[PDB]
Amino acid sequence: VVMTQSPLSLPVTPGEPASISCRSSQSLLHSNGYNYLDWYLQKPGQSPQLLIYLGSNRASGVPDRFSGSGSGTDFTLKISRVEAEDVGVYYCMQSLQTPRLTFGPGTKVDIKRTVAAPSVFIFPPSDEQLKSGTASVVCLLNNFYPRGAKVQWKVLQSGNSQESVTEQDSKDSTYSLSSTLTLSKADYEKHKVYACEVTHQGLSSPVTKSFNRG
Amino acid sequence: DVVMTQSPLSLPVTPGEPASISCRSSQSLLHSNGYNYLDWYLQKPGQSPQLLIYLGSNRASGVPDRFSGSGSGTDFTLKISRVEAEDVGVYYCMQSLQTPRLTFGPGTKVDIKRTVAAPSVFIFPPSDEQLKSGTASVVCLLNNFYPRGAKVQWKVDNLQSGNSQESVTEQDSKDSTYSLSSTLTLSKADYEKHKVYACEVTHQGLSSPVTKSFNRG
Amino acid sequence: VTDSEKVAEYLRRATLDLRAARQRIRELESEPIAIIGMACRLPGGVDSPEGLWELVDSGTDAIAGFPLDRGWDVEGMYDPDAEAPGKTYVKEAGFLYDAGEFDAGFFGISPREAVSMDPQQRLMLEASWEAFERAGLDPARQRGTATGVFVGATATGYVGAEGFAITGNMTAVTSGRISYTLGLQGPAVTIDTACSSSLVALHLACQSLRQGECTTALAGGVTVMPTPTAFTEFSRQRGLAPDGRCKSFAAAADGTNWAEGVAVLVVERLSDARRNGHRVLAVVRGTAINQDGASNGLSAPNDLAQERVIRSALDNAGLTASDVDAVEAHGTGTTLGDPIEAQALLAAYGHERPAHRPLRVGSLKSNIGHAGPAAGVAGVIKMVMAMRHGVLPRSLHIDEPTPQVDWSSGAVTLLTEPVDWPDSDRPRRAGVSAFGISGTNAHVILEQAPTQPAPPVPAAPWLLSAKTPAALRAQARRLHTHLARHPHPDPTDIAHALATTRTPHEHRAALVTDDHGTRGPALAALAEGAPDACLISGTALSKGRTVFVFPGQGSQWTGMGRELLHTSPEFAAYIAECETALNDFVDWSLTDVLRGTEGAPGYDRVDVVQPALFAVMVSLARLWQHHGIHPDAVIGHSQGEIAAAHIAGALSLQDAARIVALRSQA
Amino acid sequence: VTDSEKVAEYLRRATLDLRAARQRIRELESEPIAIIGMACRLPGGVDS
Amino acid sequence: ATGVFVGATATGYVGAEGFAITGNMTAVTSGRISYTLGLQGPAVTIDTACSSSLVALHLACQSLRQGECTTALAGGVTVMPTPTAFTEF
Amino acid sequence: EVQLVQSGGGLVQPGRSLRLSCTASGFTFGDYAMSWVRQAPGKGLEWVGFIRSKAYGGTTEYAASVKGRFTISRDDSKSIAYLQMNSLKTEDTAVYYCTRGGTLFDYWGQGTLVTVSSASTKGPSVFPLAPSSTAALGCLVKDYFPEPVTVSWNSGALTSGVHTFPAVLQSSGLYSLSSVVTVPSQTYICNVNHKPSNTKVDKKVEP
Amino acid sequence: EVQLVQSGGGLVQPGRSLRLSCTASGFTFGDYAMSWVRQAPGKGLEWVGFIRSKAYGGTTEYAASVKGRFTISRDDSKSIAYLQMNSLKTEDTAVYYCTRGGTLFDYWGQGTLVTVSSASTKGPSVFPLAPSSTAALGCLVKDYFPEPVTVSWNSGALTSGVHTFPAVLQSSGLYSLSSVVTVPSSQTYICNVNHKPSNTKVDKKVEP
Residue A33: its chain D contacts at CB < 8 A? Predict the structure, then answer.
C-alpha cells in the first residue's frame, strides 16, 4: 500500500517563498504520464478546498501563488507570497490507489516570529472542588513559540492528563497551553509532591515546577 | 451496430455571414462520462487537417475564436461567426465512441456563395492525329457555372458508363465558379459506328436538360 | 474505483477550469463597458442629456452671436476680408453664455479662488457632479473610491490669491481637481489630442476599467474660448464657414465653426454595473485609435487611416459592418474633410449589407458646431439618447448630399429627415467618430443596454436636502416639475432613490403621507416655502450625541401600539419578548391589554399601567435601535429608569420585568 | 482501445489548452516590457 | 503600428501664418513625430504635471499589452521659452 | 455558481439513527459523484464514503469503519445527497462535509457538526485558581455537557492577557474548559455564561 | 513548439517495401500514441493505423485493408516513428499523415506523398482541340507517367481565361489532362507543355 509523508510543521513569514514538500512510498506516476496526486488546504475553521490536482495543474479560483511541482515519488507545493489567510493545514493526498482511508497528518502552517520561551504557572487544586470530592491540578504555559512543548506530571502519571492549545494569537502570534491532571479525593491524599516538567525548543532545560500540599 | 454520421453534403457561405454545419448520429454519443465523443476537424484546400473542436464543445487552443461546437446526444452543430475566404475547405465531424474509425466520412464542402449561373456548355470533336494514332476522345466541358454538381451524360446513341472521366477545377479566385470537363474515349474503331454522339447536361441554373449534338463520325 | 471514472473526473475539472480561463481572457481582452451615467452642457441652452435630445430632435440650430460680457470688442473685430490680423469674418458660433456661472460655495471654493480659476475646471466639476448624481451614485460617498478621471482638454489661456492662480490654470489640474474635490483615488489624466481628445480619453478609460485599475471612470471633455483667438487667427486660411454653420456632408459645405461645451460619462464595467444594480444606458462594445501618419500635410485627413480605425473598432467590438445601424460621423463641414470621411464610411461600413438597411450618417456638429475636444464624447450622448428613444435625429443644413463623394452604392445615406429606429431581431447599435486635426483618429461602437419586486412600504418618506434654503426650494420645485411629466411613478421607488442615491446636505426637509394626493401640493408648498401639514423642515447639526428619554407616568392612551402590532413585525416580536418575560409575575397577557380585548384590565389600574408602559417604551426604543439610531446615553423618570436600565444593559429583560411588575404591585 | 486510456488523450489536450490559456492571461495582464531604445537631452551638456 | 505617448504641457512660445497653428498646439507634440516618421499607432499627448511622462510610459505599456502597438515611444519634453515659471512659483 | 448546503446535524443519543442532507445548486447534479468526508475534533479528515453518478449505476462505497452502519443515497429529481447513519457510536462525533467528486473533492460544503454522547444537559461547576505566590490566575469550568460556554472577566472589562482555552472531553463524557488571565504581577472576577442551562455562575479569584 | 516532420515518400514499384519516417520535436514523444492516416487522391481521409506508448507496452493496431502488410514501430531514444509498408499495392498510392494521439489527432504532420505504379517515365502526347470553327479552344496532354507537367499558353503571354484541369489516372496507369482557354471569336495560340522528368518541351499550335 502506498504511503505519503510531509514535514509536520513549517513556520512562515508573510512575504518569503514557502515550500511544503512530501514524498511517497511508491512511484505515483501513472502509466498515462500523470502524477495521481492532489493538494488540499483547510483554513482554520473553514471547510477544506482544492489547491492543486494531478501534481501541478492549479484549480480555477485558487490564487496564482500556489504551484505544484515534482514527479515520481517526490512532490512539492511552492507558495510565492504568504499571508495570514494562507495559514492552515495542507494535505498532499494521493489518488493512484483507492480507497483513501484518511488524508494524513497534514502540514500545519503558522506565522513565524522569534523563539519565545514559556512562562510556567503551576496552580493548586482549589478547595471548592476538594469539598466537591475531586482534585484537578492545572499547569499553564503562556506566550511561547514554537508549539508542541510537552508536559509531564510526576506524582509519572500518563493516563489521566488532558492538554489543550489555543490557536495562534492575532497580536503577538504566540501559543498557550493548559494541561490538567484529575484525581479522586482518596487518590488526592496519597502523595505529597506533584511536579510538572515542561520541555520546549525555546527552553535550555526542563524547567520543572513543584507543588507540595498533598 | 456500427455508428454512422450524416451532415449536409454542401453549404455555401458569404464573407461575413454566420454559418452552421450540422451532424446527426444514429446512436446517442453521450457516454456514461457525460461527454459527447465527437470531434470536428477542418481540411483546407492543399493543406493538412487540423483539429477544430473536441468533446463536442471544447475548442482546441490556437483555433480562432469564431468556431463553436454545440449540441448533444445525437444532434450536433458547428457554428462559425465570421466566414472568411480561408475558412473554405472540408469540415469532418467524426465520432470516437466506437473505435476504430474506418473513414472520416464524406465531409462537408464549403465554398463562397454567389448568384446561380448556368453553364456555358461546349463540345469539341476528336483530333485527326489522335484517330490515326489509334484512339478517339470526344471532350465536352462546362465553363463558369455555380454551384458544383451539374451532372453530365454521353448519349452515344438513341446512355454510357464506364468509359468517362470527369474533372472539376477548384473555385475561381475572382469569379468564384467551377468548370467541368468530361473526356469520353472508346477506340479508333468504335468512333466510326454511329454519326450521333450527343452530350447532355443538367444543372439547377438550367430550366431543362441542355443537349449539344455532334452529327458526325 | 475504475480508472475510467477516476480520469473522467479530472477531465471534468480540467475542462471547467479551461472554460473559466477562456471566459477570463474574453473579459480581459474586450469586455462591454456600461455607460451608467452621462452629463453635458452644450450650446443652445442645453444642460442635460434630455436637453440635448430635445435640441437635436426638434432640429434646432444652436448657432448664435458672440458673447458680449467677456470683454470682447465684438463690434471692432469683424471685417469681410479673409486676410487681416485680429479680425474674423464669422458672426455667429456655438457658445456657453453661462460659462462663467459657477456655484463656488457648493464645492468649498472661495470667490477669489473661483475668479482666478479656469472655466474649464468649473464646468468639469459641475458636469462630473451631475454625471455621478445621474448614475444613481451619491458623489459624496465616492470619496476614497478607486475612480479614474480621464479628461480631454486644452490650454485656452484664461489669464492674496497668488497660490490659486497657479493650480487654477494648469491643464493637468483640469482632471486632478475633479479627483481632489470628490476625493477620488483612481488615476487622473488630462488627455490633449485636439478634436479627438475626449473620445480618445474614453478609450483609455475602457482600458483602465478592463485591467482592474478602476471600478468606475469619468470619460469626457471640455472646451471654452475665453478669448476670440480661435476665430481671428484660424480664419486667415478661410478655415471657418462664412455664415458659421457646419454644413456636414452637404454641397454647401464651405468650412467649419467652433463651439464651446462640456460632456462627461460615468462608465463602469457591464458585469460590475449589473452586480451593483445600476441603470445601464448604453454599452461601449469596442474602441480603437490610430494615426493618419503620412498624409498630404500635417492637418489633412487620410481615408485609409479612417477605414483602418473603423475596422479595428469593429473587430475589437466583435461586430460586423452590417451590425451597425447608424454612425455619428465627425462631419467638420470642411470642403476637403467631408468627402474623405464619406469615402472612409462607404469603404468601411457600406460595403456588405442589405440594400434596404443603409447606414444612417448624422453629425451633431450641424446642430451645435464643432464643439472641439468635448465633441466626440458629446456625440455618443446624442447617440445614446436617440438609442433610448429609437429615433435617429436629422442632420441640419443638408440641401442635398455633396457631389464630391459618390452615393451610387446606396449603402450609406444621410439623415436628411428623422428616421424611426427599428427594435427587432437585434439590439440597436451605432458608431461615433472623432477624427482629430493632429491626425489621431478615434472610433467607438455603442450597443443598446441589455434588458434586465418588493411590496410598497406605507407612507414612505420623501427626503430633500440642500446646502442653502434657496437651493432646497429649487430642489423641491425641480422634483415637482420632474414628477409632473411622469405617468404615475411608484412613490416607494422615489423615496428610496431620494434617501439612498442623494447626498444629505445641511438644510433638510421631508414629506411623510400615506396617500398620493397630498405629496404634490406638499412639494409645491415647500417650493414657495409655505408650511404644510405633512411637510417637515430643519437644519441638521454637524455634531451631537443622541439621548433616549424614558418618561414615567403620563404617556398612556387606549389602543397605543395596537396598529404597530399588525403593521410592524419587529415591534410585535419585541412585544412578544416582553410578554414572555413578564408572564412570570403578572396575571394577564400584555398583548390582550394592548389590543384591548374583552376581559383584559384597563389602564386605570395602577398595577398594569407601569408594566404596559415599560414594555411599550422598551419595544419602541429597540425599534429605534433597529432603524440604526443607536443611543449614546439614556435617562429615566421614576419608573422609566427601569426601562432605561434595560436599554443600558444594566438589567436583563427578566430582571427589569420583575422590578417593574413587583414595584407596581407594591 | 479502452475508455480508460481514451480519456487520457482528451485530458492531455485539455490541460495543454488550459496551460496555454493561463499563459495568455499572464501575458495579457503582466507581460514585461523591454526598453530597447533610449534618448535624452538634459542640462549640463548631456545629449545621450 | 507604432504608438507615440508624450508627456508635454502648453508652454507659451509664440509671413508663414499657415504653420503657427499646428506649430504651437500641444496635441501636435506627439502627432508631429507620427507625421514625420510616418508612424500609424496612436499619438497621445499626456499632461499630468511632473509625472506626465512616467504616466505616459504606463499607458504605453498598456498599449503594448493589449496588442494595439508593436512598439511605442514613451517620453516627455520640457522647455521654457519665457521665464514665467520663475516669476509665478 | 456552484453551491452545496448541508443540514440535519444536531445532538443525538448513541445507538440511534440520523440523516444528513446535502442540497446542491448551480451545476448538473446527476453528472457528478457525491462524497461524504468526516473530521473528528482535532484529528485529520477521514473519508466516510461516496456514491457514483446514476449514469455509472449509482452504486455506493463506504469505509471499513462505517460499513453497514452507514448508507448513502441521492435524489436526482431535487438534487440532494442523503447520508443515513444507523447505530451511531461515540467515535462518530465529528464535522461531516459533503463534497463533489468521488476521487477529486473540488468543492466542499460548509460542514455539519454531528455530536453523539449519552450525557444529559448539565450546568457548569466553576472553581477558582489561586494566584502563585508574573502573576497568572484563572477559573476552571467543570462538568458541563453542551456547548457553547463563555467566560468574561470582570464582565468583559478584562481583555488583555485572557486565554479561554478550547473545551476538552473527559472520560465521563463531559466537557471542561478553563479560562485564565495574566495580571501585572483590585479583585478579579470571572462570569460564566452558559446559555443551554441559563446558568449565571460568577466567582472571584484571590489567594 | 510542436513539430512533426515526415520523410521517406516518393515513387515505388508495386510489391516493394517502404519506410516512412516521422520525426517529432517540441514535446515528450514517449507519452503520445502515434497514428498514421492516409488520403487517396480524391477520397476522404482513411485511418491506416496507430501505436500506443511505451507505458502501455507499445502495442500496435492496424486497419483491415493493411493488416499484416504494414507495421508501425517507434523509438523514444531518437523520438521517431516508423511505418514499414511491405508488398505495396496500386491502391495504396496516397498522401500519408503522421499525427500524435491514438483517438484525438490534435496535431498533424505536413504529409508525404507515396505513389505505387509500375509504369516508367514517358513524355506527353499533346493534341489540339478545334473550337468548332466566346470560343473555347485548348490542347490535351496525354500519356505521361511521372508528375508534374506545366502548360503555358503563348509562352505565358496569354493567362486570362485559362483553365488547366487536374490530371487524372488513366486505366493504363498514365496521366492525362486538358488545358483550355476562352477567347473572342477571331492570333494563333500556341501551348507549350514542359515535363521535367522526360525533359520534353513539346509545343503545339492550336487552330481551327
Answer: 8, 12
Mutual orientation of helices C375-389 and C49-58 as an angle, nearest 10°?
A: 80
Is the minimum CB–CB distance between G104 and chain D shorter than 8 Å?
A: yes
Q: How many domains would you assign to chain G?
A: 2
Give the whole-angstrom CA distance, residue A86 versus residue A84: 6
As a whole number of angstroms, the distance between CA C175 and CA G135 comes to: 74
Q: Spell F31-48 as b/e; 16+ CB within 10 A means b.
A: bbbbbbbbbeeeeebbbb
Please say whether the beta carbons of G143 and G160 come within 8 A. Answer: no
Provide Rg for chain F, Cα atoms.
22
Let me know: does C178 contact C149? Beta carbons within 8 Å. Answer: yes
Query: Which residue in chain B has the smallest CA separation from F55?
Result: B32
Instruction: Tell me the chain G residues in contact with residue A33 when contact means C-beta distances shorter than 8 Å.
Output: 28, 30-31, 53, 55
| F76 in contact with B, Cβ within 8 Å | no
C16 touches chain A (CB under 8 A): yes
Physical contact, F and G (3 or more Cβ pairs within 8 A): no
* Pairing verdict, β C216-223 and C147-152: parallel
Q: Does the beta-carbon distance from G129 to B48 stay under 8 Å?
A: no
Q: Do C10 and D10 touch (CB under 8 A)?
A: no
Q: Does C195 carry a binding-site annotation? A: yes
3-class secondary structure per residue, chain A: CCCEECCCECCECECECEEEEEEECCCCECCCCCECEEEEEECCCCCEEEEEECCCEECCCCCCCEEEEEECCEEEEEECCCCHHHCEEEEEEECCCCCCCECCCCCEECECCCCECCCCCCCCCCHHHHHHCEEEEECCEEEEECCCCEEEEECCCCCCEECCECCCCCCCCCEEECCEEEEEHHHHCCCCEEEEEEECCCCCCCCEEEEECC
- Cell numbers for C533: 401639514
In which domain, by residue range, is F184 found?
Answer: 125-205
Q: Please, are residues B198 and B210 in contact by the beta-carbon 8 Å criterion? A: no
Task: Give the count of alpha carbons within 13 A of B53, CB side only.
Answer: 27
How far is residue F90's CA from residue F116's CA, in Å, rounded to a whole number?
Answer: 6
Q: Which amino acid, G197?
A: P
CB distance F96 to F6 below 8 Å: yes
The Cα F112–Cα F6 span in angstroms is 6
Pairing of strands B210-212, B198-202: antiparallel
> Is the domain defined by B114-214 classed in CATH 2.60.40.10?
yes
d(CA C187, CA C209): 11
Neighbours of chain C (3+ CB pairs under 8 A): A, B, D, E, F
Q: What DSSP line would sit under F13-34, residue for residue?
A: -SS--EEEEEEEESS-TTTSPE
CATH number at residue G19: 2.60.40.10
Domain end position, chosen among F116, F149, F183: F116
CATH fold of B1-113 reads Immunoglobulin-like (2.60.40)
- Rounded CA-CA distance C38/C47 in Å is 11
List binding-site positions of E for (R)-4'-phosphopantetheine: 50
Method in brief:
cryo-EM
| Residues carrying CATH 2.60.40.10, chain A | 1-112, 113-211
The nearest CA of chain F is from the CA of C651 a distance in Å of 13
Contact by Cβ (8 Å): C618, C647? yes
**Distance in Å, alpha carbon of C1 to nearest chain A alpha carbon:** 7
Amino acid at B186: L
Q: Is A61 in CB contact (< 8 Å) with chain C?
A: yes
We find that the CATH architecture of domain A1-112 is Sandwich (2.60)
Q: Given F54, F85, F116, which residue is the final one in a domain?
A: F116
Alpha carbons C76 and B68: distance in angstroms, whole number: 69
CA nearest neighbour of C442 among C245, C155, C152:
C152
| Amino acid (one-letter) located at C547 | V
